[PDB]
Amino acid sequence: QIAPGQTGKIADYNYKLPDDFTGCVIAWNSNNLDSKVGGNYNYRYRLFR
Amino acid sequence: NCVADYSVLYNSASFSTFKCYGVSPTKLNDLCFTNVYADSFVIRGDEVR
Numbered sequence: 001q002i003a004p005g006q007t008g009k010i011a012d013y014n015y016k017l018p019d020d021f022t023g024c025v026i027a028w029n030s031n032n033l034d035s036k037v038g039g040n041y042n043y044r045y046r047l048f049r
Numbered sequence: 050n051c052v053a054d055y056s057v058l059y060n061s062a063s064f065s066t067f068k069c070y071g072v073s074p075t076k077l078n079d080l081c082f083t084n085v086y087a088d089s090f091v092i093r094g095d096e097v098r
Contacts, residue, residue, distance in 0.1 A: 007074050009062065048060075 002027075013049045053081065066097075 001008040004021045011017065017025075034040055055078040058064060067074060 012059075 009047070014046045053085070054078070 001010040002015070002017060002025055004017050004019050006017070017023075034043075058067070059075075069077070072080070
């Protein structure tokens, strides 16, 4: 859902790219690190707005 | 002959896959149509695309 013109609880609420945005979208899997036991609360988000 | 409220979808997350080819997903509430036909069925996962 991260990209110009996308719709969703991400683009709509917590983090949004401009429709004219020019850039590079990068992602990689940290599951071997960031994942701790049952959950990691250091990373939160806005669910409702 | 009824009232279609599409704001419940965004307030409470339900649909896993939601897309609109002919119109915009968020404008379904602001713009209304005359007759609505819904074809309900079930298919295999790889048969969706």
